[PDB]
Assembly symmetry: D2
Homo-oligomer: 334 residues x 4
């Protein structure tokens, strides 16, 4: 049905979309890219990656294009999605990764410029928001603009889904200890209105708001309004970890929690398990959206009260991208 | 006032001297034991990667440091029973090596001639003090005492206020904690803790801590009610403790915050902030703990409520100010 | 009856420390206005809390259009074009231009159009009068209206080069500065104008970086004009940097003889310090010198008559440089 | 000789095995000596903070690792003379501890039953090989040999190329070098190197290296003609070496670049780039050195000329590829 993709925002996520497509020998082809710079610079960045090393395929450029593994890809530099000649090269599905079109409204522009669907790499208000292998069954043939939420949502949802199915989550709160991202600052200085995002990212633990828990309802309707949470951004370049403290509907042991999660992760391409004593750098390059860590499970019980802490690692860049692509391969065949 | 000897002139031990001089303490530090030469200890005291130049002059001789013109004997005895504490009359040993964290181990300082030992770490079931939480339990018969971990000193005042105002039924803690000398610079063996083998400045590293588990030593009413752990991360000092609690009363954020504010009023140990601070803003703190009203979160569904409360701490200097407050009291008893 | 009222344009790393240092030295200069691109609330937050130097040592509060610092009111404007900044409202006479966007006489004379009398630019700014304090500040006079203090790297390099050239002659030389990362770099890998290297994650890489410190040294030491080149390697430290110079000197030397010459050049010299301690970059953070010559790193490599001389100086590229900018400013205001 | 033992299963020792498996060497690693348990060595081999997951299966028993299905004996003898190398017939020891960097010290492996030792570091006046610079000097009667430092492996190919084309009359080197396990995580004693005592991820740290001073072992004509030092900085691996030379001939940058381009043609050890790379781009390199044409700088005044040339190196994996090339050759003489 659909096999031709445009990327808007050839950034950390945008470039990795291309990387992953090619790694899996997908039959979707990226045919156009829009950003704000030259093909020379986009090529430079695609070839040389500080988190994942040299691109595995040949890369070259001309004044209006990239050439990747011998195939040509048009490069545009339109600040406004309207102006992208998606039509020209035949781009059916826009992977929207700029951070500036996070609305059904705004991503409309891509359809105006002639693409048939848009997948947004971020939370985008009230729309179909898919975590692959949690709720991608809610996607139908009539969907045109869908969100794959945040990396944190891809981490939290599968862990929350398994606990809720096995035990029931009554209420919970999350904290993600999260790699710093391009929304933060290199040195202390203004970064819009958010005071904390103004601070040097590689030199600080920085509290930071996230909607992963607040909006979990879109992905797991039964948990709607039952979770809150935030982040602490810390000085690692990628690789993050989400802790969820829940009140569950049954009394449990750690062994029981971990066996329920082991079952949910078995033959599960999206959601991995470990009982090894890994650290964040071990998750870099993960092909899961989320890796449940059984070594960090903790049950605090005082009589009838019980707090359950469960922890899952995630490569907020590559890991999340593997989910984005799963959802895209599916969305393209409807 | 009392003469002190410091065993282990490391991150903590050096900052103990710094803080004593800074507050113009009546304690005199007369001796230091470590594993190295006066020249290396002089170099490390003068030049600090986290706190900058030492604020006083530092020199060394073959067997001493000269700090602000005052002589401090230097010994290099790896067994504490061999340290000649009597030679300069060191009465109270500030035990900062990590290698004597029990009554039975620190007894070796009493054997070597000291009267009392204050241990800069958890040390099993001994009197364990967080200043301005339970320092009123000290008395003139105590000879070996612990000030627990920096995390305990962060946790305890926040837990005490919550418990006193609302009751804590159960809770769990995670501290996002600066890396420390127990970890590894490059991936390599670090005893039996597998995760401690990993490169500390390049990883988020889960790490076990007893701060919550043994909180009953400091706040007896909370024995068995808390658990927790740490995530060690690449900042050089400056840490933050989150506690998620079920309290005995339904609350709003403002109510929690006001109660904490009252607990920090005229409290030289426990500060308050409603500013959007980050960990480097806690470096050099003179509190053991600073509650952060900006991160308070109430998650409520029917009659169920989870309360998240967060406090910052400088696990080096901030904790040290607590250690020093405890030392000054312990010395006058 | 000297100029005493300052405006700061660009209340950034450098601009905020300009205020800090002025208060710290109890300058008779008052900062009466700040221009940047944001709210007083944000500026007050950034001034109070600093990731590199810790809590501001004086009280900080703000209103809808001002900061109140140590009880003194300072106007805040948000004009992206310098020509629009209302410097006359509080009588700002000298502008300390710290934005990075007005690094030429042609650009910075906008402040004059906007009612200021003089401008001191916290950066190289082409071929205008350029001062490294205690190297060539004697060249400033009453007719100088727009002046540059060059880069932190020039303030590190110049006093060392000057001492060497005066004592032995420098016939030719090349510099490399191992330099803390700065806000011209990138947090994550992504476009950063046209410099490909500046696009790379600054806290995760050693990044070669072009600098004019050596190339334009003739503005400060005219006898070395065109005799030096160099570059930077940007590395993951937040502040604190070090400059190595490899020279061919006009004389055969020993390390001790170079060290002693430098030691004499640093005696009673508030701008240029000396060390023979085994210091590392965090020990220079908050330095009150523009440059600290490190005798422990001096190296003479000689084969017959061919001799190469390596000299190394530390610098706190933020605060240490700022101390130099402030010395130059105090003198500028009294000419 | 196809059976090898590894003394010191650290950053270099583990990558030695990783690379041997990666190139499908016929070398058989039969034994490893270190200071710890198989469990711990297994965890370290499996999880690498710089290079990611080990590409082969790893298990262990109480006295062995099993790597890609093959058993490797693990010993824990802190003195090399006691390591039982004859048990599994380890003939060539790859000496990677840092504790045996001299003929006299590494002799202990031979007293312990091995036939040859290749030392992963400089080791005084003994045969010292940078592959594809002077590996032809390896001789069938050599039994103790060095591959010098990573810095040497970076410097030597560049210096050889320049010397062969233009003559190097005198030169000085500075390497901007990733931090290593000889440094400290937090400020604390580290033998007698004061600079080594400082927190490695939080400082620029000047550091002594023999790479230039001992270059005469590799390129005898350059003996005594180079000096240099390092600045250790906060990157986990990946380094850069700058050489400032007076050459024998007047040159342009294009001419230097062209000559270096030629030395790197069909040279598996010495690579070339004219892309604007940064240090993380060298991580995982299969070269000992990658000359970077983009940083070549000629400074000329009248008749005088200074030539600055620069090459990148993965001080871990890149150097290891050189160690393996040398090992393969050494095994067959
Ligand atoms: N980095 C992560 O961990 C992560 C994880 C999950 C989701 N996301 C989301 O994915 C999106 C991208 O994040 P990223 O980290 O890749 O950001 P990034 O800053 O690395 O990349 C954004 C790219 O978009 C470009 N850009 C900005 N405005 C543009 C415009 N108007 N038109 C075209 N290009 C424009 C920039 O040039 C840049 O190349 C964001 O919405 C983010 O929330 C990020
Ligand atoms: N964040 C912190 O660093 C922190 C906070 C609170 C408590 N503590 C505790 O304080 C203690 C010291 O911590 P640190 O971070 O200063 O460690 P450190 O490693 O920086 O200091 C330890 C010092 O003890 C010396 N030493 C080791 N064994 C010795 C012996 N047998 N005899 C004499 N000297 C010896 C070492 O040479 C070193 O100088 C530990 O118990 C630690 O848990 C540390
Ligand atoms: N950081 C260093 O090591 C260093 C040392 C010496 C000199 N310098 C020079 O000092 C200058 C400032 O450097 P910095 O590191 O403080 O940069 P910075 O980015 O921290 O500060 C720039 C400030 O100017 C503001 N700004 C930008 N454009 C503006 C405009 N049109 N009008 C008003 N305000 C504007 C920004 O909002 C920010 O507050 C640059 O020229 C730089 O090269 C920097
Ligand atoms: N890391 C680099 O960049 C680099 C590059 C080239 C050469 N080298 C050199 O290679 C050697 C090892 O460096 P590394 O970075 O792997 O160091 P490392 O500290 O990572 O590893 C050393 C290993 O030896 C073990 N060890 C220590 N003493 C021992 C003993 N007496 N017997 C047995 N095992 C012992 C340790 O447990 C550790 O596993 C050194 O000589 C170093 O100079 C290092
Ligand atoms: Cl986040
Ligand atoms: Cl901890
Ligand atoms: Cl203007
Ligand atoms: Cl620079
Ligand atoms: Cl080195």
């Amino acid at each position: 049905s659909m096999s031709k993709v445009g990327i808007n925002g050839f950034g950390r996520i945008g470039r990795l979309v291309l990387r992953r497509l090619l790694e899996v020998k997908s039959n979707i082809d990226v045919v156009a890219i829009n950003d704000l710079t030259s093909p020379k610079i986009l090529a430079y960045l695609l070839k040389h990656d500080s988190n994942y090393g040299p691109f595995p395929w040949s890369v070259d450029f001309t004044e209006d294009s990239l050439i990747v593994d011998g195939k040509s890809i048009a490069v545009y530099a339109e600040k406004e999605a309207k102006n992208i000649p998606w039509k020209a090269k035949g781009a059916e599905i826009i992977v929207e990764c700029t951070g500036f079109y996070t609305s059904a409204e705004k991503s409309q522009a891509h359809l105006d410029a002639g693409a048939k669907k848009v997948l947004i790499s971020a939370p985008a208000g009230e729309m179909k928001t898919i975590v692959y292998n949690v709720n991608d069954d809610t996607l139908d043939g009539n969907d045109t603009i869908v969100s794959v939420a945040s990396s944190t949502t891809n981490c939290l949802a599968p862990m929350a889904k398994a606990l809720h199915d096995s035990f029931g989550i009554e209420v919970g709160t999350m904290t993600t200890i999260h790699a710093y991202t391009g929304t933060q600052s290199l040195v202390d200085g203004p970064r819009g209105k958010d005071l904390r995002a103004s601070r040097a990212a590689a030199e600080n633990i920085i509290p930071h708001t996230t909607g992963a828990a607040k909006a979990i309802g879109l992905v797991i309707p039964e948990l709607s309004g039952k979770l809150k949470g935030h982040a602490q951004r810390v000085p690692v370049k990628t690789g993050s970890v989400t802790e969820l403290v829940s009140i569950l509907g049954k009394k449990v042991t750690a062994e029981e929690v971990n066996n329920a999660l082991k079952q949910a992760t078995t033959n599960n391409e999206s959601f991995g398990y470990t009982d090894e004593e890994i650290v964040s750098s071990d998750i870099i390059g993960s092909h899961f959206g989320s890796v449940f860590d059984a070594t960090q499970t903790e049950i605090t019980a005082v009589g009838d009260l019980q707090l359950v802490k469960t922890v899952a690692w995630y490569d907020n860049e590559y890991g999340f991208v593997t989910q984005l692509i799963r959802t895209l391969e599916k969305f393209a065949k409807l």
